[PDB]
Amino acid sequence: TLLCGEIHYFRVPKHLWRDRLLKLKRAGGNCVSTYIPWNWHDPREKVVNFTDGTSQWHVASYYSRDLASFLELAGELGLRVIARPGPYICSEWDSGGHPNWIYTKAMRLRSLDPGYFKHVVEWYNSVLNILKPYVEREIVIGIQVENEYFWGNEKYIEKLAEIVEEKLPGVLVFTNEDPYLTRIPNTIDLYPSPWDMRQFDDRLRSYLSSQPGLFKMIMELEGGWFKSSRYGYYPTNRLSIPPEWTEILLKTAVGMGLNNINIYMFHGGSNPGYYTAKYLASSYDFEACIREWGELSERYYRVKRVFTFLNGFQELVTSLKPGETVKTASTCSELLQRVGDHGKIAVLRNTGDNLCYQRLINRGEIIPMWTPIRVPPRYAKIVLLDLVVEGTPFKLVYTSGEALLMKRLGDTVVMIIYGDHGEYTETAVEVEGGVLDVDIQGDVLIRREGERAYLVVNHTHGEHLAIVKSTRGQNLLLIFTCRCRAEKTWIVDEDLVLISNIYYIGDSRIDEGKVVINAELDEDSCGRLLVVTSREIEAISLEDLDLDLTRLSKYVYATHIPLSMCRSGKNTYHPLEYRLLEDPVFHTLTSINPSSPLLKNGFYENGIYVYRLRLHLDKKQLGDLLDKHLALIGFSDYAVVSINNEYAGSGYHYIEMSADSLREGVNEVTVILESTGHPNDGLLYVPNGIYGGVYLGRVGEIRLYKWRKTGFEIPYGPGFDLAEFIANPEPVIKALQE
Amino acid sequence: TLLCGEIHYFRVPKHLWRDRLLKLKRAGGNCVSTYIPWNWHDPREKVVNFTDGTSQWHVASYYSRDLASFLELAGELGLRVIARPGPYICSEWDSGGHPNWIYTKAMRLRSLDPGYFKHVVEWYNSVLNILKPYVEREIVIGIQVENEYFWGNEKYIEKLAEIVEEKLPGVLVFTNEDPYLTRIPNTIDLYPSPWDMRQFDDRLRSYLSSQPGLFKMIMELEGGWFKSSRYGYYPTNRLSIPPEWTEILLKTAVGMGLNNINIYMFHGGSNPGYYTAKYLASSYDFEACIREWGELSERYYRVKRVFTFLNGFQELVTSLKPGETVKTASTCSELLQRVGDHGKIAVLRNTGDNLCYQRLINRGEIIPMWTPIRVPPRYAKIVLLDLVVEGTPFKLVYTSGEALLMKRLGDTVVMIIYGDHGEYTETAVEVEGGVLDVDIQGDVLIRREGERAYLVVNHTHGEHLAIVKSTRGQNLLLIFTCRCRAEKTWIVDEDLVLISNIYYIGDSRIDEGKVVINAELDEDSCGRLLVVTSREIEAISLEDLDLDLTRLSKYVYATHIPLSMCRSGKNTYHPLEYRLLEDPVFHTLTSINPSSPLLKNGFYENGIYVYRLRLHLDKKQLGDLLDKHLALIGFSDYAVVSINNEYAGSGYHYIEMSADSLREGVNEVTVILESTGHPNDGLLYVPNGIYGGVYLGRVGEIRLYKWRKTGFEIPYGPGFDLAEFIANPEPVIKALQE
Amino acid sequence: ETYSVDSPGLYITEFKVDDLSRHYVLDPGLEFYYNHYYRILLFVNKVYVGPLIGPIDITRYLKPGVNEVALLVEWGVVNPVIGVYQYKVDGEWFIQEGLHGLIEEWFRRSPRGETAEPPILLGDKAGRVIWVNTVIPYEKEPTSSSPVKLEVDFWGCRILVFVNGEFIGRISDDSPERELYVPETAVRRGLNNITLLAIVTSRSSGIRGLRLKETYVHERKEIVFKL
Amino acid sequence: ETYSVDSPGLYITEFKVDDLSRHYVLDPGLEFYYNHYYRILLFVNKVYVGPLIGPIDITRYLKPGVNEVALLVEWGVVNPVIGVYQYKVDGEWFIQEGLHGLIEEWFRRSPRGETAEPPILLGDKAGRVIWVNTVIPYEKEPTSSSPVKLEVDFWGCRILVFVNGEFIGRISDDSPERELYVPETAVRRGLNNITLLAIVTSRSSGIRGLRLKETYVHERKEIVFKL
Numbered sequence A, B: 001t002l003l004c005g006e007i008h009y010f011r012v013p014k015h016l017w018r019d020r021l022l023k024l025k026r027a028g029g030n031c032v033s034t035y036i037p038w039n040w041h042d043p044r045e046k047v048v049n050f051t052d053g054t055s056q057w058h059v060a061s062y063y064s065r066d067l068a069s070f071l072e073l074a075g076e077l078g079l080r081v082i083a084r085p086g087p088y089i090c091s092e093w094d095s096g097g098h099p100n101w102i103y104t105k106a107m108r109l110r111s112l113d114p115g116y117f118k119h120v121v122e123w124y125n126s127v128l129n130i131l132k133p134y135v136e137r138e139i140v141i142g143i144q145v146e147n148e149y150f151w152g153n154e155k156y157i158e159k160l161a162e163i164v165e166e167k168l169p170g171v172l173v174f175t176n177e178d179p180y181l182t183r184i185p186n187t188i189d190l191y192p193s194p195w196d197m198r199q200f201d202d203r204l205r206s207y208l209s210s211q212p213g214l215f216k217m218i219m220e221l222e223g224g225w226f227k228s229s230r231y232g233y234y235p236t237n238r239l240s241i242p243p244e245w246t247e248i249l250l251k252t253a254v255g256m257g258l259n260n261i262n263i264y265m266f267h268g269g270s271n272p273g274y275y276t277a278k279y280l281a282s283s284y285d286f287e288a289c290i291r292e293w294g295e296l297s298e299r300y301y302r303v304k305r306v307f308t309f310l311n312g313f314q315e316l317v318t319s320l321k322p323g324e325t326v327k328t329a330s331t332c333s334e335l336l337q338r339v340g341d342h343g344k345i346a347v348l349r350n351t352g353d354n355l356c357y358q359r360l361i362n363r364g365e366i367i368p369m370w371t372p373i374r375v376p377p378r379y380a381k382i383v384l385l386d387l388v389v390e391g392t393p394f395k396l397v398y399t400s401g402e403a404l405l406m407k408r409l410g411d412t413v414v415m416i417i418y419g420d421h422g423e424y425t426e427t428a429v430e431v432e433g434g435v436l437d438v439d440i441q442g443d444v445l446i447r448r449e450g451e452r453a454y455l456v457v458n459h460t461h462g463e464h465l466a467i468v469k470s471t472r473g474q475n476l477l478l479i480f481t482c483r484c485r486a487e488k489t490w491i492v493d494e495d496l497v498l499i500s501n502i503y504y505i506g507d508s509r510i511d512e513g514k515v516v517i518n519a520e521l522d523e524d525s526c527g528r529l530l531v532v533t534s535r536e537i538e539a540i541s542l543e544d545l546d547l548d549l550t551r552l553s554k555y556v557y558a559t560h561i562p563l564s565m566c567r568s569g570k571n572t573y574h575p576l577e578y579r580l581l582e583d584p585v586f587h588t589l590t591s592i593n594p595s596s597p598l599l600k601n602g603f604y605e606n607g608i609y610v611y612r613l614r615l616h617l618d619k620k621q622l623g624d625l626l627d628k629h630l631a632l633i634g635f636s637d638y639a640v641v642s643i644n645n646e647y648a649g650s651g652y653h654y655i656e657m658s659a660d661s662l663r664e665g666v667n668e669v670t671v672i673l674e675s676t677g678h679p680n681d682g683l684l685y686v687p688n689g690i691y692g693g694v695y696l697g698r699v700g701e702i703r704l705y706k707w708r709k710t711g712f713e714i715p716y717g718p719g720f721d722l723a724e725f726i727a728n729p730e731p732v733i734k735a736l737q738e
Numbered sequence C, D: 001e002t003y004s005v006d007s008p009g010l011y012i013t014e015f016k017v018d019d020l021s022r023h024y025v026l027d028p029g030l031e032f033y034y035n036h037y038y039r040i041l042l043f044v045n046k047v048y049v050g051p052l053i054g055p056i057d058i059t060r061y062l063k064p065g066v067n068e069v070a071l072l073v074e075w076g077v078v079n080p081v082i083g084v085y086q087y088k089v090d091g092e093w094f095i096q097e098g099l100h101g102l103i104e105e106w107f108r109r110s111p112r113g114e115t116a117e118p119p120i121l122l123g124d125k126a127g128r129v130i131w132v133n134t135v136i137p138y139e140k141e142p143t144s145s146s147p148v149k150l151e152v153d154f155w156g157c158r159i160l161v162f163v164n165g166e167f168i169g170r171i172s173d174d175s176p177e178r179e180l181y182v183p184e185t186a187v188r189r190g191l192n193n194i195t196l197l198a199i200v201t202s203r204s205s206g207i208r209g210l211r212l213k214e215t216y217v218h219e220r221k222e223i224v225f226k227l
Helices: A014-025 A067-076 A114-136 A154-167 A197-209 A243-255 A298-312 A314-318 A483-487 A619-623 A722-727 A731-736 B014-025 B067-076 B114-136 B154-167 B197-209 B243-255 B298-312 B314-318 B483-487 B619-623 B722-727 B731-736
Strands: A003-006 A031-035 A080-084 A140-144 A172-174 A261-265 A334-339 A344-350 A356-358 A373-375 A379-388 A394-399 A402-409 A412-419 A424-431 A435-441 A444-449 A452-458 A464-470 A475-482 A489-493 A496-499 A515-521 A527-532 A539-542 A545-547 A549-553 A556-561 A578-582 A590-592 A607-617 A629-635 A639-643 A646-651 A654-658 A665-675 A690-696 A700-703 B003-006 B031-035 B080-084 B140-144 B172-174 B261-265 B334-339 B344-350 B356-358 B373-375 B379-388 B394-399 B402-409 B412-419 B424-431 B435-441 B444-449 B452-458 B464-470 B475-482 B489-493 B496-499 B515-521 B527-532 B539-542 B545-547 B549-553 B556-561 B578-582 B590-592 B607-617 B629-635 B639-643 B646-651 B654-658 B665-675 B690-696 B700-703 C009-017 C023-027 C040-044 C047-051 C065-073 C081-085 C091-097 C114-116 C129-138 C148-155 C157-163 C166-172 C179-182 C190-200 C206-214 C219-226 D009-017 D023-027 D040-044 D047-051 D065-073 D081-085 D091-097 D114-116 D129-138 D148-155 D157-163 D166-172 D179-182 D190-200 D206-214 D219-226
Touching: A003 A298, A014 A067, A031 A261, A067 A080, A067 A114, A080 A114, A114 A140, A114 A154, A154 A172, A197 A243, A243 A261, A243 A298, A243 A334, A243 A344, A243 A379, A298 A314, A298 A402, A298 A483, A344 A356, A344 A373, A373 A379, A379 A402, A394 A402, A394 A412, A402 A489, A412 A424, A412 A483, A412 A496, A424 A435, A424 A464, A424 A475, A435 A444, A435 A452, A435 A549, A444 A464, A452 A464, A464 A549, A475 A483, A475 A527, A483 A489, A527 C206, A539 A556, A545 A556, A607 A690, A629 A639, A629 A665, A629 D023, A629 D081, A639 A654, A665 A690, A690 D023, A690 D081, A731 D009, A731 D040, A731 D065, B003 B298, B014 B067, B031 B261, B067 B080, B067 B114, B080 B114, B114 B140, B114 B154, B154 B172, B197 B243, B243 B261, B243 B298, B243 B334, B243 B344, B243 B379, B298 B314, B298 B402, B298 B483, B344 B356, B344 B373, B373 B379, B379 B402, B394 B402, B394 B412, B402 B489, B412 B424, B412 B483, B412 B496, B424 B435, B424 B464, B424 B475, B435 B444, B435 B452, B435 B549, B444 B464, B452 B464, B464 B549, B475 B483, B475 B527, B483 B489, B527 D206, B539 B556, B545 B556, B607 B690, B629 B639, B629 B665, B629 C023, B629 C081, B639 B654, B665 B690, B690 C023, B690 C081, B731 C009, B731 C040, B731 C065, C129 C206, C148 C157, C148 C166, C148 C190, C157 C179, C157 C206, C166 C179, C190 C206, D129 D206, D148 D157, D148 D166, D148 D190, D157 D179, D157 D206, D166 D179, D190 D206
Parallel strands: A003 A031, A003 A261, A031 A080, A080 A140, A140 A172, A412 A475, B003 B031, B003 B261, B031 B080, B080 B140, B140 B172, B412 B475
Antiparallel strands: A334 A344, A344 A379, A356 A373, A379 A394, A394 A424, A402 A412, A424 A452, A435 A464, A444 A452, A464 A475, A489 A496, A496 A527, A515 D219, A527 A556, A539 A545, A539 D219, A549 A556, A578 D114, A578 D129, A590 D091, A607 A665, A607 D091, A629 A654, A629 A690, A639 A646, A639 A665, A646 A654, A700 D081, B334 B344, B344 B379, B356 B373, B379 B394, B394 B424, B402 B412, B424 B452, B435 B464, B444 B452, B464 B475, B489 B496, B496 B527, B515 C219, B527 B556, B539 B545, B539 C219, B549 B556, B578 C114, B578 C129, B590 C091, B607 B665, B607 C091, B629 B654, B629 B690, B639 B646, B639 B665, B646 B654, B700 C081, C009 C065, C023 C081, C040 C047, C040 C065, C129 C190, C148 C179, C148 C206, C157 C166, C157 C190, D009 D065, D023 D081, D040 D047, D040 D065, D129 D190, D148 D179, D148 D206, D157 D166, D157 D190
């Protein structure tokens, strides 16, 4: 199984790569997605960078092209990698990945055009030579050939995939969202509006039936959404994505049987200056799991519980198939079910804002006897059924609480189970050698009936322990926690689990004596720390303060981080002084042809340009209309205009200045133009600079609102090239034929 | 029109009544709803309190029964009052309002039972004598006879209403939600789950057609939801209510033509100890506009914009009727329309998380010419159409931005209009004496065509001014603000409007020279303050710092609160010491009969009780089964049990202790019982104390899950008394008749 | 036909009893309890028992051999079970309203107590009421500009909070948040006697700490206009 | 038939021109512009003009009297208008990449400037680039435990932010938030030279202030286990 966050090394400072990738590993992510943007590495038709070097005023020294170090660091952290090296990446990036010199080379991008595709072969030779050692090391596990070619031409994506299958033998090669592929695997990018499970379930059910025997993945699940200028909103444009929603989509995808999931932006981070799409913010925070500034959001902890379950029960979850044999007793939750070789899962989804109480019928009997299954509002609960705990006498017949984790410590299996405060969960344990005894700590109620112990637990802000003993001397330790302490549980080693209030657990030094971990504490992080391990913990200290220990059982230590340790603080810092300088604006000027894009003149960067136009006017000003405007029309995405050194107007693609300061003879017009980015589709050449022109008067304004809509069908499919269609459109036939 | 928040004087400390009611007045609330709970004022079958006095250990000295002072304070603040004096109030209160001595008097509550209704007449004589002076002062404008008698008997609610119409001649008298009333007005309590506009629109459309010619009100709109123990969740049980949702429901109710709206909990506040329903939290924060601790939430500022519009355009909004003559150009927003004597409103609702761009067709022409109407995601925009500004030559033909406010200052009408940052709004102004000229400040573009000025404004973090002059010397000052500065605009006097970043504007001393206002600043509150007034402001100071003035125009002053003024801080304070004392638990004991409720024994309070049971056991313990439990069954809502001074178990209504410490002879069992509250329905006697008993063993457990469902219809209607039906149920006939 | 009994209607089910010597106590299940109680009417055989209060001994209404339960649920949910018991236990019963330390107002002034370290273990003291008394310094004028929440970190307890003798609220293991708003009328400038009545409910109980947190700290500034 | 032209299909409309002496410049409307550009193909008469780049002079494609516009919108929205102009203006054009102060790296070291008070008025200086240079003390080691956001309060500007010469981001009047995250790799312990390139866009412009806000301050504590 692949459990991914997407974390873009080109949007995260190189110093913070370990800080962000270890936050993903600590969530239970076992793989990193990233793009490898072509224009990040070859900005200027020169040499592919692949280092910490930078040669743009708008890209800070701490952003890096050193993908080889990001791949080695993902290797150090034990993360696998999905490389998305496409010539096109989308991703709200500048030109969606294309370097802005290709617009001089090719009129028909994302195609088998010999103009475009020759330069894509040079890019794939560059990036696949960088990837090869990390692919041979099994760090890079899958290559994604481009984002979202929705329109279908198999020829283009198969040539992309054939270059990869030539340079990188035997890897996974696949497309984001092309419905029309036969041999190349396709993925899905599920971005549904909140509480629209109808579209999410139907897109999953459609997708899971597609391409028999080929790899399934959600290559982009909704981990958040981006923010824009001009039409965007604070959290995201959408406007906020509920953290409850991302978790319901994750648990739904699991319940529908899609094992491989990438959350898209797990961090988001920051756009490096003018490496951003047209109208994007410099924040690419995305409202992600990890916020742009490094904060573990509510979405992080929710996602972390699902990704922890999918590691802890990976053997179960990979053995699953549909089955559809369990029933609900009440229609208050939707049931998504799977059955497997050595266990079963029931995802009970409550899309409502009421609390749901549920029962399941498994073999003509209602399973949880003394408790209902509580299903929280805006929630999906993974109920775990019939699970044979491998190599042991224990069958976890059901748990009404969510299991977070399962682990093996010598004689003992450890399982962590959770519910909300004041939730009653019942867990049934069936022992194939009989129950020898059950020990407990906390509010656990034991009912014993033949080979079964039924464990009814009232969840509270701590751990309740049950230790079911088998006659064979194997043990099952069940640890029952509230939801927020399952959210703040860290497997800091395979033999060290910390159940805690702690905000984050960070880096570790698993020494042969004196183990050390880099905990980060917020004002909630104090209270009990519960440590599960086979190591004989002799003492625990925090920052050379000694902490008190209770050894609850052979594998478990309680200790308390004092409420005096954590601090609440949020300081602000203000200027000593503000100093003003007027820029003279003009360094040196070179001549450009009227209406010519600045990329046709070798200016491949986005950002600020100043035009000087030396416009000629004469007695034809007496032939100008009473409106007397000057209009600057068809320019890239922001300009401030000055006419004969008087400020005249500003705006986005069209400015209609009052022509107050025009004169007979030569008129200087200065246009300080800022190009925010090219758009992040990869099909249209939207030029930077003034691609239009300067115009006089306003004789009229013809509004176009009496449309006839003629129902034309674009012939999308395995033979359809969208770039050929944009260049040579067939609706000319249907315009002639009415 | 009635624009209400509900603010319970019995849930707010008396010192904080002015602090909370002035926060409602500052939102544009022009009326307060409150219950007047019968058990708050007569707890113990003695004398009705109506003062600051208290005689319960669980009610703090700062909670008051002094309703007369709350009514006078609502009068001081210029708020009207809706009194909800019902014998029943619901409201997640103890017994839903009933004083717990009535369970000794009446087996059939909320009925014309002479047991119940005699005591309701004593309550109505008590509370209506307190209300009479404030009703005659026109402070109390409407009397709501009880919450939510859904089941219909007109006789009972008409006798409640007849007592009111006798003691208080000519007032509004009405019920919360009884569908079956002929002469008595009925209201609605709309609590829809987020984004379910289908139920909200259908319940509104149903309700607005009901009871021809009688008063319409939403007596309880969703301003949030409550939180509970045992099955509840942090913000609310639901789990969070979006602040976007409450505003869409408000603007929908306005667009559907319901003028009178109460937000239910505008503050919520706190339950006074054991004055709370069964399983409620002591927080009644409700996730309200004003949080329990006094915080202006996002919901406050959203609500405040709607309530400010509904005051500012009250003359428009009271003249409205359905009309349904404007059309949208695109299906991306839902249009709810009204037409009126001197203007028109189009509510454009976007329930989607995409941004919508919209056009309207009014008279066979698309109205906004150079801009679309931006409709934000999760939003409803009130577009204002055809508005003749009364007593002036100005018609506001449309505005693509929301108008917040309109005001008259001598020659000038002031109108405040808003949009989001980078929104383009177009406002058309038609002048019946012709436009003389237009002055501007900021990014306003003027297009003049005959008697019209069209004003296209690019919204930013400040005010843009346009001053349209008529030939007659009347002026229209349009002030264009971003949404967050319209949210933080205060009409601190009818001749003083502050457009600001300031968090709250508080109390005022409108002196005849040196005006003073009690501003409260958060870390966002600095930046420009824009003051609109006919007063000649000579200086502005903040806390004896002098602020710089620019007089932008005759009625407008800009000034800046320095970013050095505000502070960010969130301190925590910890114990010096913790001191433990064991309570001996027992003061003095009195004898009670087995299974008798403690209210039948004169204990009318909720809270802690200790029972001692002196149980007798003998050789019949040798006849007990191998399970050997003792069960305490049928008790009120929490107990901790100790058997022969050994702790034996705890739980909610049923505890099944292991009988380890029982003996032959007398056994002392101690039951520390906490009764959290009675339930907040008003129909069932759910007794406090142990109403059940103590039982031995567990011979078996008969689970009941093979049900036949027989489709019985309860005959709800104008003749149906639910308390008669609960006492004398007719399904006995249908049980006999299969 | 149906397992749920969770929606409006008249539901009937059938069950069998051996001898009528046991006590048959009907439990409505944890699904049934809500702050606004469910209108559900119980009949045992063709005889009306009453609305569901909670758990009920139905033994009076049932006969040897086969029996019926009917439920006119008008609103709400149940999941009924009958527990079967060998005896109902005889004994004289007594009550007190409140507790000794409560009716002596130990929230105003308790006796002196023994000092404890911040992780107060109470699970030994289960079945009892412990008063945890603390003093918190609050060295500033209390105001609605900087509201105070008391957060209690604890488990295994039902805790009643008093600040300066004013009753603030209750917190329990199953309560939805660990914070109580304490008003500016309860808080004092200087030392605050903040006191917890913990009824100790489990062999695991303890209080891990108290804090007063200011939710935020706003500046109330007097803004002044000369005319 | 339809007003919107906002959904997939081939839309046709018809319009009339008098003389062919004017310039007819088609504007696609503010609805059209998106970060992922809309696949909308323009034809004027039966002749293909191209995909919509933005505003286009369509005068080449049109004839005296009646004309047609067709739009194969595959995805996205337009609201087309034709502006009609008397002349297109002749003149030689020149460019510079960037600005003098930018290509001289005034974000690393500007010349000295005149001091201004915190409400910096710029609307007089509209049409120009002003460098606002500030020093902010940050007297603590910068860490991801206490991340920094720079908030700029301003209007009427497009502002580029540099911290210690590292380019942090852009803010504009129509940007969705006024805060930029500045990384621990940009921030220095001691004085931070934080510099704004403000291209001054309107007669109303100004900067009202800067603050670095720490979003929160967590304690990174080294937790240690003896074995």
